[PDB]
Model the fold of this input.
Amino acid sequence: KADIHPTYEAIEATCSCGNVIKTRSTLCKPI
Amino acid sequence: SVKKETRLRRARKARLKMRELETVRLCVYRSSQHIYAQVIAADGGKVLASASTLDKDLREGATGNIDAAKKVGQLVAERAKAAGVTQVAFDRSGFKYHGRVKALADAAREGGLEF
Amino acid sequence: RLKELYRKEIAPKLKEELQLANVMEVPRVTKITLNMGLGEAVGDKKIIENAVADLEKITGQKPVVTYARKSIAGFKIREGWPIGVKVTLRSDRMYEFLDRLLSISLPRVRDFRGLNAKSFDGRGNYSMGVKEQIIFPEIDYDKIDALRGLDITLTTTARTDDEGRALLRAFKFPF
Amino acid sequence: MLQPKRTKFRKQMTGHNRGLAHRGSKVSFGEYALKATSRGRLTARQIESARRALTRHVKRGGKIWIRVFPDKPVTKKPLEVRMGKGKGGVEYWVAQIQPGKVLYEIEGVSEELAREAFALAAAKLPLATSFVKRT
Amino acid sequence: FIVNAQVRSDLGKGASRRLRRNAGLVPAVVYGGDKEPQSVTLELREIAKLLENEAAFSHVIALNVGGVKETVLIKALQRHPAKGFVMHADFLRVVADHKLTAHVPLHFINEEVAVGVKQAGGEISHTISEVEVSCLPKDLPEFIEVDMAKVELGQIVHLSDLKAPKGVELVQLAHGNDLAVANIHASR
Amino acid sequence: TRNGRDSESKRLGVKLFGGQAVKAGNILVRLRGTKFHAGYGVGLGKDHTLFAKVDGVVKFETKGAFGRKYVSIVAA
RNA sequence: UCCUAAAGAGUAACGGAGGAGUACGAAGGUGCGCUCAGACCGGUCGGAAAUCGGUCGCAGAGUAUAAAGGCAAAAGCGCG
RNA sequence: UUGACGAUCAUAGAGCGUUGGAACCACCUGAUCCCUUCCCGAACUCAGAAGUGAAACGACGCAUCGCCGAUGGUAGUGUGGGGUCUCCCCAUGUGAGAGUAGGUCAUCGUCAAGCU
Done:
């Protein structure tokens, strides 16, 4: 349908977008 | 399976009410490759006319389209008139009367066979 | 992303590993119904519209708020009141959601929060709840209210619970 | 005494007491038994007179089973009351015996100790009972 | 162990009760594996000697129907409930090969001195008897010896503990169960 | 405390037994909710009252799975 | 409505037990879809028991209203 | 070799075990286009195979559970007469239920389609 409202334009955004917003583009584990 | 017995659970209503009224039944069976159609006499155990894709003079390799099923309902409207059959009923057999099912049953009304 | 990581790398990797005989025994991940909300102080029903707009925004789909069948567990609902959420995620956008969790949701927890107190059920499914923040794919962390928590109930296509463990062990569940 | 805990109804018909006893006539637990050879009905205070007779003539051991259980309530109108105003209140409870039914069983004793112990319990019951063995 | 019979060509309720008061006979049948069922009269004075015998229930008896001889095992006794005496007998032909089923007495052979009895104030409560059999008709089990002289105040004894000799099965282990047999407990 | 009060006995039953001849309005069974189901040529009215539609002979046959009782009228 | 009531209907007692003196414009019509209670194991503040996932089910649920007789073309549940 | 529609409703069921493809069948790929979801291509539907018989489905085996079930006896009962008469017995017609010996891994029909 059309009732599902998308954030998928930004779920399909930049993945390795630095360690500045996501705080990690080097590791996944916090330690 | 899961799908198969539920459309058997859906089909037993209209098939059992066509039994009580003593009507010549036009049954149908859809598959993911191709499409069958039969005309069963008024006892549920005697087949009068029957037309399929799997006859050895129609298999084009592209059966199971909506354009393939229009020819199936074409050829079954005339073997029943060759068998002398009108005044029939249409059991959709649990299939939602929308696509390849509905397009076949329009070919029956064009053929002169009337519901 | 992880779908085609699964299809090309993991899908032959697990076949000899569990000494499987064909393609079709190799287990898949099917859906995420996930949860949300128990019914904390929903005699007055107006907190749902906050909790709807919570999970509506961080998933992409819409809640289907669940009513009560016959309630006794803490309360007498006079059943038929809004109590649940239940957002189901499926194939083309289930791998897309799964990459938020455990890749960039690990920094938003702090104190390892993977498989650290859980185990499976007998049929090969994994269920887990959260209360802390997860990663949001759009910036939505200061929404100031009473944060109700939720679960991440997952269903596989396994047979036993050992094959649930090797399922997405490449996705590195912390142990 | 012996009576049900909760009953689905309060009062009951009279009926009759017919037939022999084909189930209930075989000794199952004990090795000696006191089976009844005349039809009647036992009123649940006779059972405790007959039970407390057997349990003091043993004094040592043995195991006792009580095969029969009263479940049939029986009414009785009070005195100085004309007939036909309802139905009287339940005063006591009754079991219904018919020839062949086994009443008491005993095991773990001598036969000649037990034969002279069922003599004591038979003098409290209004039926003609007998002595039987386990086969 | 031997009986001798007759033919009984009179079937009903009326003719079957006149046998018991006039002549003193007892009806019976012989039904088996190979042949038809055949009815039979026996005396109430004879069966009385066999039913008084101990192991005669789990044992082969030779029957003389006419001058006809057959090895016959007995599996039924319909018995008059009020007075107590034998009514029709209902026994069985014995084929050399078809398995068989009967019931077997127990004895509890050594319980004079038991550790549960001599050391602690003891009791021995025989719950079961007449345990069945599933044998081959060539070699018969007359009885089964059980020995509860041995271990404990406070143990029950199952069917798994006692042993059926020379390769004889027990039906209760063929079903998914194991009945308790005897107990040792404290007296009141 | 006091209890008389019975009702007045509706006269239920089964008319028209195994070999009868019928008409078109005969009733054949009052009923109390489907002891007998509608067989071949019978009606099943409002309060589950069976009735005939064609003429012939009553059958009372047991058929099918669930073992239900089918009252059919045979043109014989 | 059940029992007395004797396997067709009927049938008494100041004989044993219970209920009514109404609701509904959808709780009606019709087409299209869909299955219960409970058991259990996993799961955030509930927690013996709410919602969710799962296996086992085989009517033990439900039926506007008493009990009896029924109900998979479901006579039960949802939508146009 | 299968597929549809029946006949008969367990001696036809459940459980266990084995086994079948490229014809059928099922899973499968993608939803652009029909069409659908009180959220979701799960279900419904459309265009379609590759791939696979794993699952499912059919066949083939096992009586382990279930289900059928004799013969004999026994209970009860119509009419006639009895007796020690709140219960039974005799003459005569009728005759279960439970249990026992044992049985059962169904039997057919109509077409399309595989020696056929």
Remarks:
- Residues 6, 9-10, 12-17, 96 of chain B lie near RNA strand G (CB under 10 Å from a C1').
- Chain B has one domain: 1-115.
- Helices of chain B lie at 3-20, 66-82, 100-110.
